[PDB]
């Protein structure tokens, strides 16, 4: 039934992949309220659609800044992928468009904040709390990978908490549809698999390593490999000696040692049994995968909701103007956007 879900899901994805939605709104349809996020390229603002009174989150990219950062192809990936996908724990793209200066992706507004902010504040999550979120990521990766998509930037910063306490994965700036291997050095230092650091040519397994990093960080309050400067972090990763907090259950550790596995023939998610190596782990024995999918499990944490359009679950950011030049920038580079 998982096989059957995913085959129908692939058919859905393919139609949208081969014929992307394009130019489905305009900047002037929106009232910009507040900047709720930055990076890894551009910024994301709470906006309000006049015609429905709905709130959305609008990502804006400056086309010239994208060109300078050699993110053209990645930005086209991001929008082409995001418009095509559909899964409960993936943030939804409602509209995309562009003007002379910028690209815009209007997503659904997820008011609950980034997981990062709650994780840092509270300190760490209990194993049950972390498992609840981890299960969501497992199913989301099961879904993306079945589509040949690699996500390539899992971290708490990219995981939004909705009004029901479930996750939306946001920021597809490095997501790529690739069947074999790929080589681009991208991701976030703490979450890179050794094979990326070592410039080897890698695949969807980097995402399962990054899951290992996440689970550990959710449970411990800090990541498995940290230092003040990325090079020091890479050194720790390629040694691969990870220390677990004494509070980690023996199941948690054993999950993590199979996810934070330098050896691709042994790293879970990669093997002949695929994602079932994760799903049937003992750390996950209490997990009801169908109930997680259907959003029937009771969330361990439900964010405060002060109203529609409330942004108090996000940090405050410097506000930048949206400049729209009279001359078209980078027309040809972004023609399919």
């Amino acid at each position: 039934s998982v096989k059957e879900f995913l085959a129908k899901a692939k058919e859905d994805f393919l139609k949208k992949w081969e014929n992307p939605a394009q130019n489905t709104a305009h900047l002037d349809q929106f009232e910009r309220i507040k900047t709720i996020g930055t990076g890894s390229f551009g910024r994301v603002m709470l906006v309000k659609h006049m015609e429905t009174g709905n709130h959305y989150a609008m990502k804006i990219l400056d086309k010239q800044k994208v060109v300078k950062l050699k993110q053209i192809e990645h930005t086209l990936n991001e929008k082409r992928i995001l418009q095509a996908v559909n899964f409960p724990f993936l943030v939804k793209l409602e509209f995309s468009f562009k003007d002379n200066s910028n690209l815009y992706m209007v997503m659904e507004y997820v008011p609950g904040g980034e997981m990062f902010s709650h994780l840092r504040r509270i300190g760490r999550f209990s194993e049950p709390h972390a498992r609840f979120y981890a299960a969501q990521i497992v199913l989301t990766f099961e879904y993306l990978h079945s589509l040949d998509l690699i996500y390539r930037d899992l971290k708490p910063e990219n995981l939004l908490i909705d009004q029901q306490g479930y996750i939306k994965v946001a920021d597809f700036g490095f997501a790529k549809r690739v069947k074999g291997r790929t080589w681009t050095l991208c991701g976030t230092p703490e979450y890179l698999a050794p094979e990326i650091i070592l410039s080897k040519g890698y695949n969807k397994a980097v995402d399962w390593w990054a899951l290992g990093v996440l689970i550990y960080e959710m449970a411990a309050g800090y990541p498995p490999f940290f230092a003040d400067q990325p090079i020091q972090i890479y050194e720790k990763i390629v040694s691969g000696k990870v220390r677990f907090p004494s509070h980690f259950s023996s199941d948690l550790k054993d999950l993590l040692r199979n996810l934070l596995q330098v050896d691709l023939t042994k790293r879970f998610g990669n093997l002949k049994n695929g994602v079932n190596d994760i799903k049937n782990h003992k750390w996950f024995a209490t997990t009801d995968w169908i109930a997680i999918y259907q959003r029937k499990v009771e969330a361990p944490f439900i964010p405060k909701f002060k109203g529609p359009g409330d942004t108090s679950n996000f940090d405050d950011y410097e506000e930048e103007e949206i400049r729209v030049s009279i001359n078209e920038k980078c027309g040809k580079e972004f023609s399919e956007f």
């Binding site: 890894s40 991701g187 976030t188 940290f226």
Partner: peptide, 20 residues
């Protein structure tokens, strides 16, 4: 403790992606 080492570090804020 490891917690204290982390909290005193420069990377407890939002971490940017890298690229070459």
């Amino acid at each position: 403790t490891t917690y204290a080492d982390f909290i005193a570090s420069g990377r407890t804020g939002r971490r940017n992606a890298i690229h070459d």
